[PDB]
Amino acid sequence: PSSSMADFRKFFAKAKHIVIISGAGVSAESGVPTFRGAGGYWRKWQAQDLATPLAFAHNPSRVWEFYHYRREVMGSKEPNAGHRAIAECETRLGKQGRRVVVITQNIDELHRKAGTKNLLEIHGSLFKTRCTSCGVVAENYKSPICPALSGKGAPEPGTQDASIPVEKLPRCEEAGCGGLLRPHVVWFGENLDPAILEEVDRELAHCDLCLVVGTSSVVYPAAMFAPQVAARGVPVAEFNTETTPATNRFRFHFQGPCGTTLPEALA
């Protein structure tokens, strides 16, 4: 694990297919908290407990409050210099006939807002819904997503659940369905999309340089992506404020906010 930017740049200059894996840390400097420690809580509950099939099945109103809140917070948010460096890198290399692809754990769409085109959102999106009856996935940026959620989603401990009746939670507007919608987001304990996983596999297999940016490397299976490329003999560069369990697997580690390290790295 070197911290030599110059050695990384040598590899960067020659790379024809760069995979950039990102986690919540890439959006921290945008004012979107990660789930590490404090941001991992909402009212009395842990985010990793709310983001489960069990929690939603038994209390879809509380879970929707939680997602509504996040959708609303995400409204004000802007890509940071980390996101911008990544998008600009893709566009510049694209004109050289070189490839950059972003594989993100994040559901916040900030990579998209920054202009990134080659993007695999492996955990879905905060701004998509899926119908729990007919399975139809739709884009949704409505604020609020439904009338009953207005002013709701307050994260403060002791905030009673709005306890919205299920017919007044977001409902499918497909012809003759009316089903309860859920956020189109992969929850803990759910399968990732097999089609997306095969796209991920094709990128990992063909790439020649990999960056792992702002991820804890403890969410599976995404945590195994970069280790797998590094096993193939490919250089992996980690950009994170801390070391992680995967750190010593990687060729490079650059400590600090990725917003301040990425722009120089990717110029």
């Binding site: 304990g189 990732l192 969410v219 599976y220």
Partner: peptide, 5 residues
């Protein structure tokens, strides 16, 4: 592949 923390 199941999403796990």
């Amino acid at each position: 592949a199941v999403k796990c923390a």
